[PDB]
């Protein structure tokens, strides 16, 4: 009820969002950086060949860590809906 509880609500929610999005974004960033440094080493420059492995890497990311995200988000939503009638004002 108190504004401290509200702002905590937003923080924990958006940290959950950060945890959900961090693996995919970080995998894409690492793949892009690796392809870019390889291009710099080989002196190859086409703006389209960096887009190819990124999709494959990010799609594999759901294969490997997808169940973890799905279990984390469901637990968050379940706990939020269960604690809903105790943060009422």
């Amino acid at each position: 009820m108190t504004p401290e509880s509200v702002m905590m609500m937003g923080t924990e929610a958006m940290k959950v969002a950060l945890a959900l999005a961090a693996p995919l974004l970080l995998v894409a960033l690492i793949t892009g950086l690796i392809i870019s440094i390889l291009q710099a080493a080989t002196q190859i420059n086409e703006m389209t060949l960096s887009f190819i492995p990124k999709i494959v890497a990010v799609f594999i990311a759901i294969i490997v860590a997808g169940p973890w995200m799905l279990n984390l988000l469901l637990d968050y939503v379940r706990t939020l809906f269960s604690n809903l009638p105790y943060i009422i004002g």
Partner: protein, 253 residues
């Protein structure tokens, strides 16, 4: 006996109802479409039932241009109060949308302005957070109390009016921008530095950077930055509400 003078009761219960309902239809949270219309009408009716008997009853007939002037006055007062209150949420929405646009979340606006493709999701997040904070600080009760109080300052009866006062509400349009800049400032600046950092990377081997490495990094950095910045809005939320409230108190009179 068995009089029950109806015109007296109607004139006593009408104009306060007009002002209360005019505030209701525009005041934030009390004007959200999710509330059924009958609930809003009943709240206005009950508030008027509580308030009106204490006020001096007016005797101007409903079939006169004086009644039209009175109705216009009540509508103006109600919409002015509600809109001045709404300005703070407008400012919060502006700050959130700008943080989100510096995230690169909606890049299609820079190339196709107003092209039916825009999602200010951060703006919505902080808008609903601001609504929750406003509910917590009981701002709506204050709004109702000030709606009641503006009578003593400005009675139902037609009273003369001023000018630059309207400018003040219009000049409040500056606040939406001015306060929005500060909220952002605590994050956009660092994001700016990050973009500057990306520039240093592009000053190296040409191409092979930006649109491939900049976007995910800046998205994650914006996310964690403003996630850490979330505790900061609440003092600024109270500052915004106080600014709107004392501006209203000073200018309505």
């Amino acid at each position: 006996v068995t009089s029950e003078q109806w015109l007296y009761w109607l004139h006593l219960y009408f104009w306060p109802l007009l002002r209360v309902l005019a505030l209701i239809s525009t005041a934030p949270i009390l004007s959200e479409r999710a509330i059924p219309k009958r609930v809003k009408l009943g709240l206005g009716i009950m508030i008027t039932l509580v308030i009106a008997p204490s006020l001096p009853a007016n005797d101007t007939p409903l079939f006169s241009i004086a009644a039209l002037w009175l109705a216009m006055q009540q509508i103006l007062i109600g919409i002015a109060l509600g809109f001045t209150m709404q300005f703070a949420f407008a400012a919060v929405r502006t700050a959130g949308e700008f943080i989100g646009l510096q995230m690169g979340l909606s890049f299609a606006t820079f190339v196709d302005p107003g092209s039916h493709l825009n999602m200010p999701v951060l703006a919505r997040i902080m808008d609903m957070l601001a609504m929750l904070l406003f509910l917590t600080f009981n701002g709506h009760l204050w709004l109702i109390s000030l709606l009641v109080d503006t009578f003593h300052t400005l009675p139902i009866g037609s009273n003369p009016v001023n000018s630059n006062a309207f400018m003040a509400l219009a000049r409040a349009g500056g606040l939406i921008f001015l306060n929005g800049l500060m909220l952002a400032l605590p994050v956009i600046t660092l994001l700016l530095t990050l973009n500057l950092a990306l520039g240093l990377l592009n000053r190296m081997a040409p191409q092979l950077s930006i649109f491939v490495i900049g976007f995910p990094l800046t998205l994650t950095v914006g996310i964690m930055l403003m996630a850490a910045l979330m505790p900061l809005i609440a003092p600024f939320c109270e500052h915004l509400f106080s600014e709107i409230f004392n501006l209203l108190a000073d200018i309505v009179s």
